[PDB]
Write a protein that binds this ligand. Structure first.
Ligand SMILES: Nc1ncnc2c1ncn2[C@@H]1O[C@H](COP(=O)(O)OP(=O)(O)O)[C@@H](O)[C@H]1O
Ligand SMILES: [Mg+2]
Length: 415
C-alpha cells in the first residue's frame, strides 16, 4: 500500500501537491468547487504541519504548447499555451477564500521560480494550468520528464491528492514523483482509493454501471475493460449516440464518435459474451439546437430526426434505467444522462441521482457517483449526501473498474 502524508516530514518543507482542481467552469466562473473542497484536508495538513504548498493542477483540456515554443512567448511577456477558459486563476481565488489565507497564483507553471523561492511556511502557491504545456501529457516519457524536472525543482516533498487524474500517467502525476524520488498519497487520494478498494472487491451484485456525459472517445474505451465486473451497463448522455448509430439508428445532429462505430459494435458483442446486459436509450429529448426550450421534442424511437440533437434521455428510458437500478445492489455512475445544466434536459440526470440516492437510503444500494459535472448534479438534487460515495473521479472511477492500479497511484511510494 502507498505511503500517506501522515508519514512525511512536512515541517518547514515546500510540498509539491498535485491536486485535481478541474472544476466545472462557465463564463470563467466555478459552478461547482467540490473538487477544491475535497482537497482542503491535505492542504490543511501541510499548513498545520508547518510546510508551504505549491499546487499543480489542470483545468479542462487546453491545446497546450511545446515547451520550446514557450521561450518566445515569455519574451513577449505572454503566457505559454494560455487559454482564458482554462485558467486556474478563479481556482486560486476560491482556494484563498476557503483556506482563509492568501494563495498566490503563478501565471506560468514553468516560470514560477521567483515566487516559489520567496515562499515561507504557511504559504500557498497555485501554478497555472500545467496542461498549458504539451509535455505535461506527452506520451513520450522524455518529454514528460523534461517538464517534470523543472516542476520538481520547486519543492522538497511530493504528494499526490489528484485521484481523478490518477489514471493519467502524466508529468505532474507520475513524472515529478519519479524525478523527485518521493511521493505519498494525500488524504483525498487515500480516501477515494480506499472506498473504491473496499467496494470493488466484494460488490453486492447485481452491479450496474451507469455511464453518460461526454468525452466519448476516451470514456468509450474504458467500457470494454469493465464488462467483466458489471452486470448491467446503462448508457446515457452523449455516449449513447455512438452506440445507437453503430446499431443503425438515426442520430440526427447528436454528438457521435463516427470513428468509433465498429468499436461500439464489438463492445456490444463482448458485453453479451461477458454476461452484461447493456441498455441504451429507448427514447430521447431533443431539439434543433443546443438551447433550452420548455417542452422540447420527445421521440418514441431510438431514432432522432435529422434536424434534431438528443439532449437528454426520454421518459421511457428514465423508467427502464430507474427500474434496473432498482434491480441492483451496487451502482456506479459517471456522466450526466443529458445536458442537466438546462432544466428541460435535466430529468434523466436527476432521475438516476434520485434512484441511486433512494436505493442507498431505503435498501443499502451501494452507490458511487463520479466526475465534476456528476458531483454538481448530485449536489443540485441534494442526493449527494444520500449516496454511499461521491467521488472526485469520473473517468478515474471508471478506469479503476478494469482492476488495474492507476499509474498516478502506482507511481507513489508504496510504504
Ligand atoms: N446529450 C448530450 N449532448 C451533449 N452533451 C451532453 C449530453 N449529455 C450530457 N452532456 C454533457 O457532458 C458533460 C458531462 O460529461 P462528463 O464531462 O464526461 O462528466 P463528468 O465531468 O461527471 O465525468 C456535461 O457538460 C453534459 O452537459
Ligand atoms: Mg467534465
Amino acid at each position: 500500500e502507498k505511503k500517506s502524508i501522515n508519514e512525511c516530514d512536512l515541517k518547514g518543507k515546500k510540498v509539491l501537491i498535485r491536486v485535481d482542481f478541474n472544476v466545472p467552469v462557465k463564463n470563467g466562473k466555478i459552478t461547482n468547487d467540490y473538487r477544491i473542497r475535497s482537497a482542503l484536508p491535505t492542504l490543511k495538513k501541510v499548513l498545520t504541519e508547518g510546510g508551504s504548498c505549491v499546487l499543480m493542477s489542470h483545468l479542462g483540456r487546453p491545446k497546450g504548447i511545446p515547451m520550446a515554443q514557450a521561450g518566445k512567448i515569455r519574451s513577449t511577456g505572454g503566457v505559454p499555451g494560455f487559454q482564458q477558459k482554462a485558467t486556474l486563476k478563479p481556482v486560486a481565488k476560491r482556494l484563498s477564500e476557503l483556506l482563509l489565507r492568501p494563495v498566490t497564483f503563478a501565471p506560468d507553471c514553468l516560470n514560477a521560480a521567483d515566487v516559489v523561492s520567496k515562499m515561507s511556511p504557511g504559504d500557498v502557491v497555485l501554478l497555472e494550468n500545467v496542461r498549458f504545456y504539451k509535455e505535461e501529457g506527452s506520451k513520450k516519457a522524455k518529454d514528460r520528464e523534461a517538464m517534470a524536472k523543472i516542476l520538481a525543482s520547486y519543492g522538497d516533498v511530493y504528494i499526490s491528492d489528484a485521484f481523478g487524474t490518477a489514471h493519467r500517467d502524466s508529468a505532474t502525476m507520475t513524472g515529478i514523483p519519479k524525478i523527485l524520488g518521493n511521493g505519498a498519497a494525500g488524504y483525498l487520494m487515500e480516501k477515494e482509493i480506499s472506498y473504491f478498494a473496499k467496494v470493488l472487491g466484494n460488490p453486492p451484485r447485481p452491479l450496474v454501471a451507469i455511464v453518460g456525459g461526454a468525452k466519448v472517445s476516451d470514456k468509450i474505451q474504458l467500457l470494454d475493460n469493465m464488462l467483466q465486473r458489471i452486470d448491467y451497463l446503462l448508457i446515457g448522455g452523449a455516449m449513447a449516440y455512438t452506440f445507437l448509430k453503430a446499431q443503425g439508428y438515426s442520430i440526427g445532429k447528436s454528438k457521435c464518435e463516427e470513428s468509433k462505430l465498429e468499436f461500439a459494435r464489438s463492445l456490444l458483442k463482448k458485453a453479451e459474451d461477458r454476461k452484461v446486459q447493456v441498455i441504451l436509450p429507448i427514447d430521447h429529448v431533443c431539439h434543433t439546437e443546443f438551447k433550452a426550450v420548455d417542452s422540447p421534442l420527445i421521440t418514441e424511437d431510438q431514432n432522432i430526426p435529422e434536424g434534431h440533437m438528443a439532449l437528454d434521455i426520454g421518459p421511457k428510458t428514465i423508467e427502464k434505467y430507474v427500474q434496473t437500478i432498482g434491480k441492483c445492489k451496487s451502482a456506479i455512475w459517471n456522466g450526466p444522462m443529458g445536458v442537466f445544466e438546462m432544466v428541460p434536459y435535466s430529468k434523466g440526470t436527476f432521475a438516476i441521482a434520485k434512484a441511486m440516492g433512494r436505493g442507498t437510503h431505503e435498501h443499502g444500494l451501494m452507490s458511487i457517483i463520479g466526475g465534476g459535472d456528476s458531483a454538481s448534479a448530485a449536489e443540485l438534487s441534494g442526493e449527494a449526501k444520500r449516496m454511499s460515495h461521491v467521488s472526485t473521479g469520473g473517468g478515474a472511477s471508471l478506469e479503476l473498474l478494469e482492476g488495474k492500479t492507476l499509474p498516478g497511484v502506482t507511481v507513489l511510494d508504496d510504504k
